[PDB]
Amino acid sequence: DLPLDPLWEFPRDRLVLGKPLGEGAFGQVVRAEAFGMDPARPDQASTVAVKMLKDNASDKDLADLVSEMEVMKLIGRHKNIINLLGVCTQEGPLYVILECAAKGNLREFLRARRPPGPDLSPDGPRSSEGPLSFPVLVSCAYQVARGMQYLESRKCIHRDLAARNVLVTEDNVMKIADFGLARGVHHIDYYKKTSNGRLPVKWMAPEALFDEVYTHQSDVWSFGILLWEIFTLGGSPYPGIPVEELFSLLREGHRMDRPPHCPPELYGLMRECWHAAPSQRPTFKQLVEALDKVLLAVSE
Ligand SMILES: *C(=O)c1nc2c(C(=O)Nc3cc(O[C@H](C)c4c(Cl)cncc4Cl)c(C#N)cn3)cn(CCN3CCOCC3)c2cc1Br
């Protein structure tokens, strides 16, 4: 039905759909096997993520997915974002074939890798040593910033940047997901809590929440929250604060406390990202440079 784009079009019969990975506001994502994604190796298998409409496919759902497809065609390729691999638009359901990140999103990745507690009996020479170390946490933050810097250069705004929207590959490479998506910014239920308990309003910059204004600097605010997530190892922001209290606290200019085991350098970065005036927050370019200095300083 849709026009054929030979640049991106991929034979749907070269896809083998597997287990569903997750579902969104519009569309669901399914793990799948792809054969010959590289045209030079037609019989080579690869694992990809296929986005498709749900079965309650309204025409707004289709429009949103078509919109996401066109954004993915224009955004180009970068190491630190989920890249478009191909599409299926001819003679069958609309598929958007994306890169697959084997380790899930950044939040789940961090939460599954919290250090062993003092309730465990010491076994071996590394009893206290957890999977996560400080330089790696800094690297994760750096990669997200680089990816966001790239998206900004392509004039793209995320509007819901969070640990849950950052994906982790087999090689622990950060990949920003669901970047320039329609998210119904004129009808957000600020009290809406997701199935996993997330309150997305806690990631919104004040100008976005109060004035419905989204800029790259509003993403920087969200990045600050993401920084806090990272160094709490997947903690939920504004701990124990319901949305009603969040409203008043934000109007009073309240900010999150410095989390435990977090160096003042990084909490400093967080607070800069949460400066009230968007122009007094660092740019993503400055965030990359600042995080680079820390990363190089702890990479002897
Ligand atoms: C394939 O590489 C692969 N992917 C995963 C994922 C996974 O999450 N893949 C994934 C999800 C994507 O988007 C969805 C909607 C999503 C989810 Cl499900 C969660 N949070 C954010 C988002 Cl955007 C996209 C996109 N776009 C791309 N890829 C999860 N797993 C398993 C996780 N974990 C593995 C081992 O420990 C137990 C469970 C996989 C596996 C694989 Br092979």
Curated annotation (Swiss-Prot):
N-glycosylated. Full maturation of the glycan chains in the Golgi is essential for high affinity interaction with FGF19. Ubiquitinated. Subject to proteasomal degradation when not fully glycosylated. The modification Phosphotyrosine is found at Y190, Y191. Keywords: ATP-binding, Cell membrane, Disulfide bond, Endoplasmic reticulum, Endosome, Glycoprotein, Immunoglobulin domain, Kinase, Membrane, Nucleotide-binding, Phosphoprotein, Receptor, Repeat, Secreted, Signal, Transferase, Transmembrane, Transmembrane helix, Tyrosine-protein kinase, Ubl conjugation. The lineage of its organism: Eukaryota, Metazoa, Chordata, Craniata, Vertebrata. Belongs to the protein kinase superfamily. Tyr protein kinase family. Fibroblast growth factor receptor subfamily. One of its GO terms (biological process) is positive regulation of ERK1 and ERK2 cascade. This is Fibroblast growth factor receptor 4. Expressed in gastrointestinal epithelial cells, pancreas, and gastric and pancreatic cancer cell lines. The keyword Hydrolase does not apply. Residues 15-300 form the Protein kinase domain. One of its GO terms (molecular function) is fibroblast growth factor binding. It comes from the Eukaryota. ATP binds at L21, G22, E23, G24, A25, F26, G27, Q28, V29, K51. It is found in: Cell membrane; Endosome; Endoplasmic reticulum. Monomer. Homodimer after ligand binding. Interacts with FGF1, FGF2, FGF4, FGF6, FGF8, FGF9, FGF16, FGF17, FGF18, FGF19, FGF21 and FGF23 (in vitro). Binding affinity for FGF family members is enhanced by interactions between FGFs and heparan sulfate proteoglycans. Interacts with KLB; this strongly increases the affinity for FGF19 and FGF23. Affinity for FGF19 is strongly increased by KLB and sulfated glycosaminoglycans. GO terms for cellular component: endoplasmic reticulum; endosome; extracellular region; Golgi apparatus; plasma membrane; receptor complex; transport vesicle. The chain holds residues 453 to 752 of 802 of the full protein. Its main location: membrane. The keyword Cell membrane applies. Tyrosine-protein kinase that acts as a cell-surface receptor for fibroblast growth factors and plays a role in the regulation of cell proliferation, differentiation and migration, and in regulation of lipid metabolism, bile acid biosynthesis, glucose uptake, vitamin D metabolism and phosphate homeostasis. Required for normal down-regulation of the expression of CYP7A1, the rate-limiting enzyme in bile acid synthesis, in response to FGF19. Phosphorylates PLCG1 and FRS2. Ligand binding leads to the activation of several signaling cascades. The modification Phosphoserine is found at S121. The active site is at D160. It is linked to FGFR4 variants may be involved in the pathogenesis of various cancers. It has been found in prostate cancer as well as cancers of the breast, colon, head and neck, larynx, lung, skin. Residues 1-300 are cytoplasmic.
